[PDB]
Design a protein around this ligand. Structure first.
Ligand SMILES: Nc1ncnc2c1ncn2[C@@H]1O[C@H](COP(=O)(O)OP(=O)(O)OP(=O)(O)O)[C@@H](O)[C@H]1O
Lengths: 109, 54
């Protein structure tokens, strides 16, 4: 993680790097993500987590997410953490059923 | 049949047979309930026809 952080810090051509952190349930992933983010020491750090979104309507969600990407385009060094993608998009295997719009917004973002 | 042993015996035989019938009915019902569950599990434990109207 530290290597990647330095790489983004220094490079002039690589202007965007994205990572996946995957593993079994209960392995303790978000802790690692947060620790990397803190120790990185950038000016600008934000978090998107399901917890903030409970009770809102769909349009509200897409608005919020759009906002949270837009506000990060100041401050020339930035870090965002997205937590638990599958639950953000409303996955349940029986149908399967889920919300396609949110999925697209994230895909394009 | 309270006052005649033979009548009482007949009554008890009928009771026994009727109890056995009740047991047969119960067994059939339970077996069928257990089988209806399996078919229900079969049908929807898989990817599904394309999504509904609205
Ligand atoms: N070596 C470790 N690295 C990270 N977290 C650890 C470690 N040892 C213990 N923990 C504990 O892990 C917890 C945080 O784990 P985390 O929130 O990532 O779980 P999770 O697997 O993402 O949860 P869920 O699967 O429900 O989403 C904290 O209680 C933290 O103290």
């Amino acid at each position: 993680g530290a290597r990647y952080v330095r790489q983004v810090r220094e490079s002039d051509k690589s202007r965007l790097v994205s990572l996946l952190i995957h593993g079994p349930a209960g392995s303790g992933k978000t802790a690692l993500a947060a620790e990397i983010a803190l120790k990185s020491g950038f000016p600008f750090i934000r978090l998107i987590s399901p917890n903030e979104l409970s009770g809102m309507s769909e349009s509200a969600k897409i608005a919020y997410i759009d906002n949270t990407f837009r506000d990060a385009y100041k401050s020339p060094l930035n870090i965002l953490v997205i937590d638990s993608l599958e639950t953000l998009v409303d996955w349940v295997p029986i149908g399967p059923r889920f919300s396609n719009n949110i999925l697209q917004m994230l895909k394009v973002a | 049949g309270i006052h005649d042993t033979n009548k009482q015996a007949q009554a008890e035989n009928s009771r026994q047979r009727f109890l056995k019938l009740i047991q047969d009915y119960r067994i059939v019902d339970s077996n069928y309930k257990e089988e209806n569950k399996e078919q229900a599990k079969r049908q929807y434990m898989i990817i599904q026809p394309e999504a509904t109207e609205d």
